[PDB]
Every structure is written in C-alpha cells, then in structure tokens.
Curated annotation (Swiss-Prot), chains A, B:
This is Ribosomal RNA small subunit methyltransferase E. The gene is rsmE. Specifically methylates the N3 position of the uracil ring of uridine 1498 (m3U1498) in 16S rRNA. Acts on the fully assembled 30S ribosomal subunit. Its EC number is 2.1.1.193. Keywords: Cytoplasm, Methyltransferase, rRNA processing, S-adenosyl-L-methionine, Transferase.
C-alpha cells in the first residue's frame, strides 16, 4: 500500500484532495484508480487508512478513515549539520540520512564548501531538499518529517545553544564512539566538505566544545561519510541496535 | 495588477508562455507590454509575482518570480448541485457562486430542467463553464479553482457517498439555517430548476436524507436562488462572517 504525505493536518473521517505532487504520483505516474488502498500521514506521527474515492487528471480525491499513532522515530536526537556541496551529493545525503532516522538537518556554509548561492536559488534548493525529506519519509515509513532548516554559516550553527553532544570527525580525533561519555540522547553532528574544514575552523569548533571522533582506521568516502557516522550513532545510542 | 491563471503547475524562477486565452487577454485585448506587473496562479493555492518579458501577436512570454501561499478559500465545503437551465443563467450562477467561495459544482439533470443535451454539446458546455470558473477566480482573488464536475442525473448525485449535510430549499421546509444541527463543515446544496422538483423527486431526496430548509418568508428569484443560499451558508458556517 502506497504511503502519501499530506501537507495539511489530517483528521479521522474527512474527504480530502491530495496535494499536487501526490496527485501526480498517484494518478498520473502510478495511473491508480479507486483503486482504494492508501496510507496517509502529515507529520503528527499518526497514520491514516484512506480510500481513493475519485481520480482524474491533475486531480485525485480520497477519503480518510481510522487514524493511529505509528512511531518509527529513533529516541536518539541527531541534528546533522551537513556542509553543502555543489553536486548532487546533498540530495542523496538528505534522503539516506532520513531513512536512518536523522532528527533534523541544517545545511551549512564553510570556508571550503565551494557553494556560493543567491538568496532565491538557496530558498529553491531548500524547498527541493524538503521534498526529498518528504519522499524518503514516505518510503522508509517515518511518520514525522524532519525539518530541513534554513542554511546557516558554520560558526553560527556551532554557536547555537542546545543541550547534548557536539561531534565532528577527524582522523586525529581524541575519542571514538565507544569512549564518548554517557548517556547520549542529543547529538549535533558536523560533517565538513570534501576540501575539508580549515585549521581555523577546527580551532573554532574546539572553542565551541566539539568532541571529535575517529570512525575506524580506514579512509571513508566523502559521499557517504554522513551516513556511516549517523549509522554508528544510531547503533550505539539510538534504535538500530534495538 | 492583473491576475492570470496558468493551466500548468508553476515554479519559482522559470520563464513561461501564457496559455492562449491569457495571451489574448493580456496582449490582444489589454494591449499590455513589458509592461511587467502580473500575478499568476495555477490552482495550488499559491500566487506568483511575474514579469512580462516579451509580448507579441498570439504570443505573450513572461518570467515568474517569488511564489507564496495566499489562501482565499472558505473553510466551509459547499458542493453546489445546480440543476441545469437552457438560458444564460447557469453561467451567471457559476461565476457568482465562485466569487462567494463555492467549493465544487456539479451541473444536474432533473425531470423539469428542460435541458436535453447531446454528449459533445454537453462536453463543450462544461469546458465553457470551467473557463467561467477560471475567470471568476482571476477576478475575486481565489487561488484554488473549483472543479465543474461532469454533469450527473439528479438521483445519482443525491446517492453519492459524502460526509456532511445535504440541503434543499422548500417553502414548506421543516428547518431553517439556524435550526440545522451543528457543527456544519460540509454541505451538498441542491438547487432545482425554475419548473421545480417534482413530488417524486422531493420524496426521493427525502429517501436520501436531505434536510430541506426555509430561506426567509419572501419569494426568491430563480436566477439568484443559489447565490442567496450560498451566501447564507457562508455567513453562518463559512468565512463571510469572519
């Protein structure tokens, strides 16, 4: 049964019409009719049974049935600060991170991110990433949709007041996952760009009480370095081991 | 600033060309050039700033700018079932109804509608009415465009499964707007033809659990009877009082 996100708060026995991307996916790509099985959610951590009543071109109209809490969220809070990159790697990172239960995401600027975006082009990028978050939530069964926060400068993100651990990875780190002081329930995870963080930036994260960690003795691919780290955290402090 | 409907989904910073009726209205009737102020929408309940880049004969090409949600929709769902009539009254009814925030419209056949339309002539009529819906939306500032549903037989429309109230007007009705059980969030409103619904048709709407209502002690003109009823509903359960 297909999972659909609904950008407006859902209620038990209403009729509704799907947002445009949902109607396109269901009726225009999937050519489904009534046709009835759909499962819907809206970010409330609830999930609704629903029936395709009617369907058309541009248009798909359904009715929603019984609703219920279905919590696929990890009890660990992981806030990923991912330094932006010009390619198509940010998109894959968002998608996969969400599948691994990442709680919240802030795209970052740093000295070597190589991204130089105008206000509007960055707003557009952020909307697209929010759509990626939504689609990945449909796929992996999450019923909360993590926010893609507005982009931030590196240091400003580092400076944010927030309880919990602040981690960054470094091949010369003074800790590993297993030597981190317990318990761990909130983590801000900083992932830098391919060109890396500069010595000034490193020094600055230290001023902000970041703990840097080793992630094994092998060299990790940039592309996937976030995923690996998130997976480790989820396994050790989150639900991947439960 | 002129409001334009665009029959294709809109996006923030694209260039586009207006559909034919829009290009005719803007460049051929309004003789506008660049010339830049236009506001555009596409039924998503969003509205876009836009610039007439170029304009020609048959041709008007523009670029779209920032987009934003601008919700002029009533929170009350009113589905008008309006029995068809041969004159030019259906057109005025569609236009004005839309201006008053009617959610959805189904043109109906009944015993005394006096309309006997061939498939193709009825398809054509429905397209024209959909254009009226669009134009009225441009005018009144609505950013959703209500669907003119395919015409239906009276009883088949009555039989449709749909949560909410089902109303019809009768000078010997057993309720008024104010005696209707609360709350009211969805209404199907049946408006009959000038020759009226027959006793068999009345009896049949009762079988379908229609509630008939009085609409004041004066005799209402056929032409406008829909408008009056919609206005009342919008005032009492919708946004005309807010």
């Amino acid at each position: 049964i297909p999972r659909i996100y609904h950008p407006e708060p859902l209620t038990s026995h209403s009729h509704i019409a799907l947002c445009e991307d949902a109607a396109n996916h269901i009726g225009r790509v999937l050519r489904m009719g009534p046709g009835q099985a759909l499962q819907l959610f809206d970010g409330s951590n609830q999930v609704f049974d629903a029936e395709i009543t009617s369907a058309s071109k541009k248009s798909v109209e359904v009715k929603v049935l019984e609703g219920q809490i279905d919590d696929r969220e990890s009890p660990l809070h992981i806030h990923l600060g991912q330094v932006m990159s010009r390619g198509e790697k940010m998109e894959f990172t968002i998608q996969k991170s969400i599948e691994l239960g990442v709680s919240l995401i802030t795209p970052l600027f740093s000295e070597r991110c190589g991204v130089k975006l105008d206000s509007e082009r960055l707003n557009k990028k952020l909307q697209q990433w929010q759509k990626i978050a939504i689609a990945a939530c449909e796929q992996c069964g999450r019923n909360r949709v993590p926010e893609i926060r507005p982009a931030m400068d590196l240091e400003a993100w580092c400076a944010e007041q927030d309880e919990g651990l602040k981690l960054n990875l470094h091949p010369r780190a003074s800790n590993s996952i297993n030597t981190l002081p317990l318990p761990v329930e909130r983590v801000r995870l900083l992932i830098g760009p391919e060109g890396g963080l500069s010595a000034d930036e490193i020094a600055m994260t230290a001023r902000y009480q970041f703990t840097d960690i080793l992630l094994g003795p092998r060299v990790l691919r940039t592309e996937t370095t976030a995923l690996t780290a998130i997976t480790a955290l989820q396994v050790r402090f989150g639900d991947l081991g439960l």
